[PDB]
Amino acid sequence: ENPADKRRRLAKQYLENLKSEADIIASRLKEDVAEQQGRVFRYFGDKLLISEAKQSFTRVGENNLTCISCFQPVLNKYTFEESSNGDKNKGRLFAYTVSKDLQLTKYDITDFSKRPKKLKYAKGGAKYIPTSKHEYENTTEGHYDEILTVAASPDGKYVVTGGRDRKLIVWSTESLSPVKVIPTKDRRGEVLSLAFRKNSDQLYASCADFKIRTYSINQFSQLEILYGHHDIVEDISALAMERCVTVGARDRTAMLWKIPDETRLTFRGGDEPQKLLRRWMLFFCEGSIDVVSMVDDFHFITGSDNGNICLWSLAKKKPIFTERIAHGILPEPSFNDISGETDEELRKRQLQGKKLLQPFWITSLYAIPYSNVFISGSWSGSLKVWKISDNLRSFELLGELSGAKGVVTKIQVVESGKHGKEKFRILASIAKEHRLGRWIANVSGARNGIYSAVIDQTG
Amino acid sequence: AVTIRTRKVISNPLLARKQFVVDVLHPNRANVSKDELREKLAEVYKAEKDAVSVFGFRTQFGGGK
């Protein structure tokens, strides 16, 4: 009964299950390690059935729900033990949400047929304001300023949150109890996004002081700071490798960070409407890149404030493919509000034709790791699902889900079922306001809640 | 925490070894002794501590590396 014998037993049981499920076995065994090869190996875009998706909107009492993070246990092929923290949580799917109301809430999302079920929550307030007024003394257990982001540890043991109070509180998943507080130690070091390295305890935090901080949650320690962005680092995405990718908003640059190599690759759009119009013979100049998601260890996608969704490759500095005005144009302002004149024709002239029209922003953008399908979000009122080409040189619109109404601040996807037959559950946090600010005019019908859509595969 | 990274690794079977450059990130710490670096390098490379030799460490101006 040596440890070598125990692994052999578990490996033998695993093969027996694979025989029961079923060339096929050899192919399936390769797919167990396809993630180590950073390539797209999940081609299920054509098998998805968007039309028959079961939509549902769950209302929440929190105002301006800011981010959502989902935890899915995964079987470890090396040890054949599930990622669930305890035996009780075997095969339990969780989602964690944060809002500008300073509330962290965990939900149960195991049952795809049922709505999310609240389990526990933690709220902050004015009691947690530090008295010291020194940055290194900002070590209070709760939040006192807007929470902007949340991330669930891949081991199911910790959930970490951060926001405008310049702290990084790590909570226990079971009780939502704070176990460590890590100040960023900067006057303008507000945490804007968090990304865990897949199947690892390494965390990447993109802050407002133009820097990226990396932590080891198991050690509860900051490791390094990355420099190079010339404006706020708004979003950050990571995969199994140590190659996180970030976007810098107004500096209009995406950066890929090779952490072991201590180098970075800089990507820039460089589109100009005059040539775009000429080649055609409404095109909007990009102002800032707000969202990013890694399709692959070698590919990622970004969404800009002009509605452009671009596909990138590590080999090329410029985008390989772009989807302009992905979510359409904002409604034209009412002529009864543009001007105070009685004559309608005078008011119509103030609309200036179509010059005041501006595109929807890409507020959310999520790509399922190592697949060919990704989801975008805005406040248009629908979630659009896109499929990437087999050669990874383009993408097309797979479908839409119109249930969501409001600002899509964050998107997540969780799957269940056997290898052949997966049902995909899309969870999106919906707010009445943009996460970073209150600029967006109130959208008619927008509500604060959790948008849910269950998608099944047939063919 | 202290981070240790190895780069420019050359397998040199002529001298029966692996040669590399070692980067140590030690924020809020003066520096890392050669002995403890040898212990951690032995751990990561799965070798005896007696088989690891480290030298020529220069702290960067400003500290921390």
Partner: peptide, 28 residues
């Protein structure tokens, strides 16, 4: 639009990828 010969003149060893890569670890 209409507007729109005889040339008289072993491979090297293929490059091998690095056998070893960098390793990283953190402690304390």
């Amino acid at each position: 639009n209409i507007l729109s010969r005889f040339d008289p003149s072993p491979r090297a060893a293929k490059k091998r990828r690095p056998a070893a890569k960098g390793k990283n670890l953190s402690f304390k």
